[PDB]
Design a protein around this ligand. Structure first.
Ligand SMILES: O=c1n(Cc2ccc(O)cc2)[nH]c2c(Cc3ccccc3)nc(-c3ccc(O)cc3)c[n+]12
Length: 295
């Protein structure tokens, strides 16, 4: 239904350091909860468009486009590592009138950014809802989807060609992990940030190169994931909602990683990796119920 123009015309923009980030912000009013939605690779705030209306009745809902993605600014040095994204997203957090306690709803690399933000601002966290999330370092490939060889390929010089020239993540990976078929308006919304070939597509390539593989990953990312995984593994006072996807992609592995995490509820919905496009109403209602139980 809702087109890219329709969605981004509901969004605001805010200067962030040298650049600017676009974001959805629900209409100002009286509200008891503030919920931030973080997408990952290769999507944008558009990914939450059908989830958010089920949470807005009870929360101010923010959804930023990460730097270089959606309608946020492109960085001239083309450097979009995890640590760069966190720099701009942290500044964004500081610029949108957040109350003292927020709930984070995150997905894919958005969960990596959000988990790290929560671990660094533990006093600001009311709750965490996560799905298909970066919950741990990948220490043995046998407990995870078998993408070892794909990651090796994407780290190779063939990565530049697959992504920058052929837009592999948008054109092949994205539709392959959505059970239904996206309308052309929906698929154009995901295309829009990356229509120009070359370095405009750089974030969708840098993101998989950051994947924290023990002994094979960037060590700044590994150290961050290890530290937020330790903290999460005993976060007794942080109510957590793991939305498990069936069949999912990482969902099976995440179930095993977090089986002994305290204060995590699990709700299951139908979907592959981009579960928001297959079960948005179930995902939004679960978040609504989760916030309702918080009070
Ligand atoms: O880093 C990657 N994350 C971040 C992440 C890590 C651990 C975790 O628990 C959660 C999230 N995710 C991916 C995905 C996921 C996906 C995207 C779209 C469709 C299907 C699957 N797929 C790849 C990849 C797949 C083929 C390739 O040829 C190259 C890369 C890489 N990552």
């Amino acid at each position: 239904t809702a087109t890219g123009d329709e969605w981004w015309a509901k969004c605001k923009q805010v200067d962030v350091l040298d650049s600017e980030m676009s974001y959805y912000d629900s209409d100002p009013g009286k509200h008891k909860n503030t919920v931030i939605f973080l997408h990952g690779n290769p999507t944008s705030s558009y990914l939450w468009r059908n989830v958010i209306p089920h949470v807005e009745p009870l929360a101010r809902c923010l959804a930023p486009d990460l730097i270089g993605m959606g309608k946020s600014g492109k960085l001239p040095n083309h450097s979009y590592r995890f640590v760069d994204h966190y720099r701009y997203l942290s500044a964004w957090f500081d610029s949108v009138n957040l109350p003292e306690k927020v709930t984070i709803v995150c997905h894919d690399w958005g969960s990596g950014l959000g988990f790290h933000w929560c671990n660094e601002h533990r006093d600001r966290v009311k709750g965490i809802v996560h799905m298909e999330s970066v919950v741990d370092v990948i220490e043995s490939w046998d407990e995870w989807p078998d993408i070892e060889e794909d990651i090796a390929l994407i780290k190779s010089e063939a990565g530049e060609e697959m992504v920058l020239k052929k837009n592999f993540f948008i054109e092949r990976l994205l539709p392959s992990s959505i059970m239904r078929k996206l309308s052309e308006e929906e698929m154009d919304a995901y295309r829009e940030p990356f229509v120009e070939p070359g370095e405009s597509r750089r974030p969708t390539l840098t993101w998989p190169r950051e994947i924290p593989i023990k002994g094979d990953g960037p060590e700044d990312v590994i150290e961050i994931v290890k530290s937020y995984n330790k903290w999460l593994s005993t976060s007794k006072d942080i109510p957590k909602l793991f939305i498990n996807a069936d069949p999912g992609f990482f969902s099976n592995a995440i179930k095993k990683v977090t089986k002994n995490w305290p204060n995590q509820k699990t709700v299951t919905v139908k979907g592959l990796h981009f579960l928001q496009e297959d079960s948005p109403e179930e995902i939004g209602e679960a978040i609504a119920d989760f916030l309702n139980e918080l009070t």
